[PDB]
Design an enzyme around this catalytic site. Structure first.
Site, PDB file in Angstrom:
ATOM      1  N   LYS C 154      95.184  18.086  43.046  1.00  0.00           N
ATOM      2  CA  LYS C 154      94.945  17.947  42.207  1.00  0.00           C
ATOM      3  C   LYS C 154      95.127  19.128  40.952  1.00  0.00           C
ATOM      4  CE  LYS C 154      90.591  17.532  43.850  1.00  0.00           C
ATOM      5  NZ  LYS C 154      91.032  17.077  44.971  1.00  0.00           N
ATOM      6  N   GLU C 180      85.630  25.591  40.519  1.00  0.00           N
ATOM      7  CA  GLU C 180      86.287  26.400  41.350  1.00  0.00           C
ATOM      8  C   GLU C 180      86.700  26.908  42.354  1.00  0.00           C
ATOM      9  OE1 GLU C 180      87.106  22.672  41.942  1.00  0.00           O
ATOM     10  OE2 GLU C 180      88.998  22.344  41.795  1.00  0.00           O
ATOM     11  N   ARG C 181      88.050  27.334  42.504  1.00  0.00           N
ATOM     12  CA  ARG C 181      88.230  28.806  43.075  1.00  0.00           C
ATOM     13  C   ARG C 181      88.547  30.292  42.164  1.00  0.00           C
ATOM     14  NH1 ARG C 181      91.136  25.095  45.913  1.00  0.00           N
ATOM     15  NH2 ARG C 181      90.504  24.732  48.281  1.00  0.00           N
TER      16      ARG C 181
HETATM   17  N1  LIG Z   1     103.231  19.029  44.745  1.00  0.00           N
HETATM   18  C1  LIG Z   1     103.111  19.136  46.295  1.00  0.00           C
HETATM   19  N2  LIG Z   1     104.139  19.629  46.702  1.00  0.00           N
HETATM   20  C2  LIG Z   1     104.073  19.803  48.207  1.00  0.00           C
HETATM   21  N3  LIG Z   1     103.011  20.067  48.483  1.00  0.00           N
HETATM   22  C3  LIG Z   1     101.962  20.470  48.095  1.00  0.00           C
HETATM   23  C4  LIG Z   1     101.622  19.174  46.447  1.00  0.00           C
HETATM   24  N4  LIG Z   1     101.088  18.793  45.944  1.00  0.00           N
HETATM   25  C5  LIG Z   1      99.610  19.808  47.177  1.00  0.00           C
HETATM   26  N5  LIG Z   1     100.225  19.931  48.019  1.00  0.00           N
HETATM   27  C6  LIG Z   1     100.142  20.170  49.330  1.00  0.00           C
HETATM   28  O1  LIG Z   1      98.048  20.284  49.191  1.00  0.00           O
HETATM   29  C7  LIG Z   1      97.708  22.141  49.178  1.00  0.00           C
HETATM   30  C8  LIG Z   1      97.208  22.406  48.369  1.00  0.00           C
HETATM   31  O2  LIG Z   1      96.934  20.988  47.225  1.00  0.00           O
HETATM   32  P1  LIG Z   1      95.731  21.772  46.092  1.00  0.00           P
HETATM   33  O3  LIG Z   1      96.867  21.520  45.063  1.00  0.00           O
HETATM   34  O4  LIG Z   1      94.784  22.701  46.482  1.00  0.00           O
HETATM   35  O5  LIG Z   1      94.812  20.431  46.059  1.00  0.00           O
HETATM   36  P2  LIG Z   1      93.176  20.095  45.079  1.00  0.00           P
HETATM   37  O6  LIG Z   1      92.945  20.442  44.360  1.00  0.00           O
HETATM   38  O7  LIG Z   1      92.636  18.884  45.348  1.00  0.00           O
HETATM   39  O8  LIG Z   1      92.211  20.722  47.123  1.00  0.00           O
HETATM   40  C9  LIG Z   1      99.462  22.821  49.088  1.00  0.00           C
HETATM   41  O9  LIG Z   1      99.026  23.724  49.590  1.00  0.00           O
HETATM   42  C10 LIG Z   1      99.909  22.141  48.884  1.00  0.00           C
HETATM   43  O10 LIG Z   1     100.134  22.289  51.239  1.00  0.00           O
HETATM   44 MG   LIG Z   2      91.578  22.535  43.419  1.00  0.00          MG
END
Ligand SMILES: Nc1ncnc2c1ncn2[C@@H]1O[C@H](COP(=O)(O)OP(=O)(O)O)[C@@H](O)[C@H]1O
Ligand SMILES: [Mg+2]
Ligand SMILES: Nc1ncnc2c1ncn2[C@@H]1O[C@H](COP(=O)(O)OP(=O)(O)OP(=O)(O)O)[C@@H](O)[C@H]1O
Ligand SMILES: [Mg+2]
Lengths: 35, 477, 466, 81, 456
Positions: C154, C180-181
């Site tokens: 997300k 969030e973080r």
């Molecule tokens: N578009 C993407 N391409 C490759 N990896 C992805 C992508 N989106 C998410 N990821 C993987 O998911 C990990 C964390 O996603 P994140 O943005 O933190 O979602 P959330 O906020 O729901 O936890 C990323 O570090 C990556 O490993």
């Molecule tokens: Mg997040």
């Protein structure tokens, strides 16, 4: 759990029903011609 | 005098209703006549609900509660290094009292946006799979998640033992003080862990906070925050700290006990609504500071235990939402002998890539790509992919309580990724690895010293590496 | 008016007033604190006692401590002076750059726009993301929702959208970080400083930041979304500007409401949530809207607890959105990124009279073939691939090629993937998927469509594999 | 839903038993198409056993959740009196 | 301190004291009853009232009936005079053999050993049973899960562990019947009498029995494990022994704690278990440990509800288990006794750093050859027939005759030392007995007895 494949209505329960109707529609055509 | 002193009205369910204490603050430490301590949780118009840090057996109706005037805090400083303390900072190793000069509140809010900077410098675990594929940087929160008996505590202990090579040197920049928080573990397991750290001479830079399975649930709830305060001391005084919470699953279970005994509405899996906040406010305090705030850091390695590998459960997903990545440990791998049983397709480090050294990057980009291909395949080319991947998976295995220096890992991964091991059969990869590592340690400390001082592999060092590995593979079984 | 604290239970504080009971939603100031501790009146309890929610930590509060009534709700600085600055839930600057010297202040509690102010125009917003642009396209001035469990992407997707839309945006932008973080907020701040979208030296900044993160007590996490709303609403109404509002994460609003509802003395609802979940969500969400006075394109990341889309919070959010992007963990474990579920993401402008018959037919055919593959999944899993028809095998092969070609490398994902990001125009997306559906690439392997941009890169990758 | 998961468990357990019996029957009739049928039914039984294991995990998870939800409903009804 | 009953709701009794309120966990004595009724304090309700849980039935209780404070928790007789006797949760004899004339009494509620009293490296507890000692060894001061119930010789294995730890280590045993069926408790008493483990005529009894019956209120069933643990604690801390403690069943201990917590009005946690599930289990299990005086090793029968291993009760019990002994009926119907499943029994100290490289490698080789033989059975080549032969011989050599079965079977019982087990399986694996018939290993002790049986 007898007849649980058809009762779960999955891709296998639809495959089973299609078979029973195909086989028995062919039998009924072969049984009505003689009849 | 019912203004600094109260009388217990009721006791049971871990909460003592206290009459009086009119000047007590919210979240203030109170002291019972039995010698136990508590925390003022609910200030009410006619009573104070006190969370007892100990057994309710020691507190009776009518007992005197005096207030200490201090919001709950723990002793912090260098004087805790080498000591085993409980969740309140009292030494339980029999080595006498802690001579601490400073106390620090356990519920201090994490730093804001401005005091922080990006994670840039590496936190070396000494584990080839972690240090190469899931690199951790100082200031990161990396979760260690897996089933029971998959090797999580072993990863944490290898990291702590690994920090010795930096804590003995003269580079004050590169030192790392460790904190191990045991939450809900067996007491004998913590005793054996402290002995393992004493043998490896890793206790002189380690604090162990112990809230074990027989301790009251408020102590297991408080232990992570006490440990985090002990680490925030270093984080805020220019030094670097690593903290392991082993594990946050049992801390969430202790908090659920406390919450259900307070008759609060249960949610998913009967957990309270603030079980996410419980871990979020804690793991936010692991931060990398900018240089106007000292430049220090606090790294967090929380541990979470799953049930039958389910990582989409409530508490696992909460912590995955809080941390900067996770190291998955699988049972199916651990049984097959692949140890550390790290799943490389699922483990990730979001912010650690910028911390990996240049040499480790040079070998690990290739290793990661080859492993991804080996995963995506399992003729005459795919067979070579499979062979290389199998050799790399035996190269990633490692023993317990023996972490490796970064240059030795670089040498081993180098031998693996350039393709020298394609000759050997897979059952001989570990034999070759150990023999070659011993050879390079014995007769080639100059190349390793150059790679370690340079942080990268120069074409000079690359040529020397190729020479050494070809000669060894020639003269090897 | 001055009252005194009579009870402190967590983030909830009871205050008893001798004179002048403050209205509900008024902000109260606690006296004798080192920093500003604001209490927001939530309930009138009777006997001249109110029940409030604290916007900060309540540690150190003593029963009998004095509390002043401000005479108005929480008022934050609104204006063009908030652009490039960071403020917290109560409008205080948290970027160490001094006071935000605006000329007006707006309460964070306001009425939703009336029915006669709504705007019905539905022009598309191209994002450069193949699956989004094809199957569930976003609309300008609409409400976008990105659903997903823990660690599915997300934040990566919302940062890709900030990169692909907000820099190319002509108006202003507001990023509300909700629960969030904090390090993600630091990353975003510094990335926007280097990319010039925030300027520390003059008044050319185009983004306002509002952060109450997951280290904050539940009152701050419950009202910081409203603070960001207020900034965006000023830009929409008094400036007539086109606004971009990014909220990550909006589920934390509901989660914090639940945490405080525990202590406000309310009988819990399903899954322990507050009984007021839907009306709280509605009061908040109805203000995030395009009126005929100005536009707000809104992008909200919705966390899905334990990956359960039927959880009351995401299930209630579903009704407030014009476009939903539902990320799936099962799709993310197949390596397909973004993890968009193509049979669970919808859009209201997916309509032949809005996107054209070509776009609509390509999208509907893609979804048909993916649904057919999903129907075959059981037989494929047990009886193997060989027990199918030849038409079913062709469907499976084309559906797998389409699954691969829905993935895409992002520019924000380059750092940990090495592949350069791709921004695929809508024409190229429609063309590539029309061609795959036609069968023009039934000879290429499926692994050639994985992680590419346009279809020409797919044929190039196929030519480089063979 | 617990009843959907139980339906699916029952269905796949039946499929696994049938493919195992078919594998044994092909092993008897084989003593080139019979070998292919024997290996194919062996693979089908193995895949069915893996689906059965994953669904048994899901079923236990769902039944624990259902017990917890009903308890929470009863508790919340009793606490409102 | 004298109190008076103010409320009786089932097994929960509220007692009001007009002076000297008793602490929590104190036992109270209800006055004017024909049988001893003991109430254990659970909470201080305020207004000088405590809430208690009864250890026996509460029928016939009157509001205002006098209640005496004992001044300590439930105290039970501890000593060598408890061996061979049966006592209930409150320490009185239930075998009708007279009073238990020990010199001292111990409270059943005690804190676990401190941090500095813990042993810092794990040692093995040699039981003299070949399959256990080799493949899934027991640790001193560890917890062992005994899986498998009726028809797999659970009682024979229990009595043999009692006998072997009494002979090899000189340490006594304690059996706690948590939620015991009275019929099966009588059966166990008489099998222990007939196998010599209990001696009704001289002081050579090896085990002490503590029975919390199924028809007792949930408080008694929740405290009987503590009663047994208190007897074992005496034998460890005052006589420096390596004690065995049997808890049959441990799921019933969890179930009784859940019932007691529900009776006290506490909100159930997930799946209906007490909110204090982990802390109840922990306060019990942490007293089972190796101290500097001696140790207490605990064999605990595990029942798994709905075959769900992620259920909170097993999941909480498994966090404390150091080993696992699975008694399989597929092994018993195969003819092997003890019916331990050698591939599903596990141990945490099956680690080279703990048991030694030689032990670890022999055990690993045995397990690998048994897995290979299962694979080969599934398909029924060149040396696979030799693997089949060696694995059949290993299967037979895992068997063993027990001393507690001597009067019934006639065969002599064998207590095989650890080295003899290790080297016997090592030799069978190397091929030193590839000529001897496979039935020369069935029901023998050391490998020398196998060659001696092959001679005949
Ligand atoms: N578009 C993407 N391409 C490759 N990896 C992805 C992508 N989106 C998410 N990821 C993987 O998911 C990990 C964390 O996603 P994140 O943005 O933190 O979602 P959330 O906020 O729901 O936890 C990323 O570090 C990556 O490993
Ligand atoms: Mg997040
Ligand atoms: N890298 C390794 N190599 C060999 N053996 C290992 C390795 N890691 C762990 N082990 C073994 O597996 C056992 C279990 O590992 P460990 O206790 O560290 O994991 P855990 O998940 O913390 O277990 P628990 O659930 O009890 O906390 C260890 O005692 C150790 O003997
Ligand atoms: Mg551990």
């Amino acid at each position: 759990g007898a007849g649980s494949i058809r009762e779960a209505g999955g891709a296998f329960g639809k495959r089973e029903q299609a078979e029973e109707e195909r086989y028995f529609r062919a039998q009924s055509r072969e049984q009505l011609a003689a009849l | 005098d019912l203004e600094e002193t109260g009388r217990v009205l009721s006791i049971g369910d871990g909460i003592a209703r206290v009459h009086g204490l009119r000047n007590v603050q919210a979240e203030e430490m109170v002291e019972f006549s039995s010698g136990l301590k508590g925390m003022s949780l609910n200030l009410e118009p006619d009573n104070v609900g006190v969370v007892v840090f100990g057994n309710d057996k020691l507190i009776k109706e009518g007992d005197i509660v005096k207030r200490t005037g201090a919001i709950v805090d723990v002793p912090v400083g260098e004087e805790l290094l080498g000591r085993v303390v409980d969740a309140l900072g009292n030494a339980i190793d029999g080595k006498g009292p802690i001579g601490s000069k400073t106390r620090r509140r356990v519920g201090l809010k994490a730093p804001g946006i401005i005091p922080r900077i990006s994670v840039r410098e590496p936190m070396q675990t000494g584990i080839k799979a972690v240090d190469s594929l899931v690199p951790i940087g100082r200031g990161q929160r990396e979760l260690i998640i897996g089933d029971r008996q998959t090797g999580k505590t072993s990863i944490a202990i290898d990291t702590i033992i690994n920090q010795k090579r930096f804590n003995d040197g003269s580079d004050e920049k590169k030192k790392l003080y460790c904190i191990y928080v045991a939450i809900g573990q067996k007491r004998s397991t913590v005793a054996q862990l402290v002995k393992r750290l004493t043998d490896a001479d890793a206790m002189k830079y380690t604090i162990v906070v112990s809230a074990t399975a027989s301790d009251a649930a408020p102590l297991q709830y408080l232990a992570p925050y006490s440990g985090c305060s002990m680490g925030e001391y270093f984080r805020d005084n220019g030094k670097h700290a690593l903290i392991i919470y082993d594990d946050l699953s049992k801390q969430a279970v202790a908090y659920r006990q406390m919450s259900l005994l307070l008759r609060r509405p249960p949610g998913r899996e009967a957990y309270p609504g603030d079980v996410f906040y419980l871990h979020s406010r804690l793991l936010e305090r692991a931060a990398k500071m900018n240089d106007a705030f000292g430049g220090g850091s606090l790294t967090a390695l929380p541990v979470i235990e799953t049930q039958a590998g389910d990582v989409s459960a409530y508490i696992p997903t909460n912590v995955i939402s809080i941390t900067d990545g996770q190291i998955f440990l699988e049972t199916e791998l651990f049984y097959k002998g692949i140890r550390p049983a790290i799943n490389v397709g699922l483990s990730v480090s979001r912010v650690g890539s910028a911390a990996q050294t240049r040499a480790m990057k040079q070998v690990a980009g290739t290793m990661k790509l080859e492993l991804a291909q080996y995963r995506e395949v399992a003729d005459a080319a795919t067979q070579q992919l499979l062979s290389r991947g199998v050799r790399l998976t035996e190269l990633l295995k490692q023993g317990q309580y023996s972490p490796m220096a970064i240059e030795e890992q670089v040498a081993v991964i180098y031998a693996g990724v350039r393709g020298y091991l394609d000759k050997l059969e897979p059952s001989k990869i570990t034999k070759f690895e150990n023999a070659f590592l011993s050879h390079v340690v014995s007769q080639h400390q100059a190349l390793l010293g150059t790679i370690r001082a340079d942080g990268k592999i120069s074409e000079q060092s690359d040529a020397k590496l190729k020479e050494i590995v070809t000669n060894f593979l020639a003269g090897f079984e | 008016a001055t009252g005194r604290i009579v009870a402190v239970i967590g983030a909830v504080v009871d205050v008893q007033f001798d004179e002048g009971l403050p209205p509900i939603l008024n902000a109260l100031e606690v006296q004798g604190r080192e920093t500003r501790l604001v209490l927001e009146v939530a309930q009138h309890l009777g006997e001249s006692t109110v029940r409030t929610i604290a916007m900060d930590g309540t540690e150190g509060l003593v029963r009998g401590q004095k509390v002043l009534d401000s005479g108005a709700p929480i008022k934050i600085p609104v204006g063009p002076e908030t652009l490039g600055r960071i403020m917290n839930v109560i409008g205080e600057p948290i970027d160490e750059r001094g006071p935000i010297k605006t000329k007006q202040f707006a309460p964070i509690h306001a009425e939703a726009p009336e029915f006669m102010e709504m705007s019905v125009e539905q022009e598309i917003l191209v994002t450069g993301i193949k699956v989004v642009d094809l199957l569930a396209p976003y609309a300008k001035g609409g409400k976008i929702g990105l659903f997903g469990g823990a660690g599915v992407g997300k934040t990566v997707l919302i940062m890709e959208l900030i990169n692909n839309v907000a820099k190319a945006h002509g108006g202003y932008s507001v990023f509300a970080g909700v629960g969030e973080r904090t390090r993600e907020g630091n990353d975003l701040y510094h990335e926007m400083i280097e990319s010039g979208v925030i300027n520390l030296k003059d008044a050319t900044s185009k983004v306002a930041l509002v952060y109450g993160q997951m280290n904050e007590p539940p009152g701050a996490r419950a009202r910081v979304a409203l603070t960001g709303l207020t900034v965006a609403e000023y830009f929409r109404d008094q400036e007539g500007q086109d606004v971009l509002l990014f909220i990550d994460n909006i589920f934390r609003f509901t989660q914090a409401g639940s945490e405080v509802s525990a202590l406000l003395g309310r009988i819990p609802s399903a899954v322990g949530y507050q009984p007021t979940l839907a009306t709280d969500m509605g009061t908040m969400q109805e203000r995030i809207t395009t009126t005929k006075k100005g536009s707000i394109t809104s992008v909200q990341a919705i966390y899905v607890p334990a990956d359960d889309l039927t959880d009351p919070a995401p299930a209630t959010t579903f009704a407030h959105l014009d476009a939903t992007t539902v990320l799936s963990r099962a799709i993310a474990e197949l390596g397909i990124y973004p993890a968009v579920d193509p049979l669970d993401s919808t859009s209201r402008i997916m309509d032949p009279n809005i996107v054209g018959s070509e776009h609509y037919d390509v999208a509907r055919g893609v979804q048909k073939i993916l649904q057919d593959y999903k129907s075959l999944q059981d037989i494929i899993a047990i009886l193997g691939m060989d027990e199918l028809s030849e038409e079913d095998k062709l469907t499976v092969s084309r559906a797998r090629k389409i699954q691969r070609f829905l993935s895409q490398p992002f520019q924000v994902a380059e750092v940990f993937t090495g592949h350069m990001g791709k921004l695929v125009p809508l024409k190229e997306t429609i063309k590539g998927f029309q061609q795959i559906l036609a069968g023009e690439y039934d000879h290429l392997p499926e692994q050639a469509f994985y992680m590419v941009g346009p279809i020409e890169e797919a044929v190039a990758k196929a030519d480089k594999l063979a | 839903t617990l009843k959907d998961i139980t339906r699916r468990l029952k269905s796949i357990k039946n499929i696994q038993k049938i493919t195992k019996s078919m594998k044994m029957v092909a092993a008897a009739k084989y003593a080139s198409e019979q070998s292919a049928r024997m290996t194919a039914m062996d693979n089908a039984s193995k895949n069915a056993s893996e689906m059965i294991d994953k669904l048994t995990l899901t079923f236990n998870r769902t039944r624990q959740a259902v017990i917890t939800k009903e308890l929470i409903e009863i508790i919340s009804g009793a606490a409102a009196l």
